[PDB]
Amino acid sequence: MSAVEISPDVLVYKSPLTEQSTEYASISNNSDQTIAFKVKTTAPKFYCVRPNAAVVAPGETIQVQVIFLGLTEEPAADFKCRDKFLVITLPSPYDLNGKAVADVWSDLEAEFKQQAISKKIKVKYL
Numbered sequence: 001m002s003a004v005e006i007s008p009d010v011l012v013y014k015s016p017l018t019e020q021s022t023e024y025a026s027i028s029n030n031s032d033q034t035i036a037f038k039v040k041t042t043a044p045k046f047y048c049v050r051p052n053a054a055v056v057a058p059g060e061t062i063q064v065q066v067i068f069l070g071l072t073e074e075p076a077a078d079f080k081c082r083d084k085f086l087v088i089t090l091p092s093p094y095d096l097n098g099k100a101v102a103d104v105w106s107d108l109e110a111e112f113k114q115q116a117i118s119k120k121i122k123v124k125y126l
């Protein structure tokens with residue numbers, strides 16, 4: 001029932017792929033209740049995600065930097081990147097009491113995993 005929007009479907013990193021480059025995702029909370037999101041990276045050695053977990057207020061949009069750290073050599077044109085990012089969103093109706101989102105995410109997940117809104121963002125090279 002949560003009106004949460006996660007975008008985009010595919011993050012596109014352009015050549016040269018031996019150079020650092022930042023793409024951006026977005027999580028928009030169009031519901032009337034604050035949510036919390038976490039981003040899991042399938043290839044953490046090559047990407048840095050900021051923020052990896054945070055709260056989104058009603059009507060707020062959080063842009064997430066996905067920083068590709070580059071590769072040692074340019075890859076083949078036919079090569080198909082298999083890296084993915086799982087964005088998971090949950091209700092966050094309890095005050096964090098100063099703790100971070102990651103610190104509470106285990107309990108929040110154990111409570112609301114059935115109501116989680118998830119999106120798998122793919123990665124392609126260009």
Ligand SMILES: O=C(O)CN(CCN(CC(=O)O)CC(=O)O)CC(=O)O
Pocket residue numbers: 012022023024
């Ligand atoms: O996502 C956007 O709207 C902004 N994009 C649009 C332009 N993109 C296309 C893409 O994301 O595949 C790069 C480009 O084609 O120059 C810029 C970016 O990638 O940082």
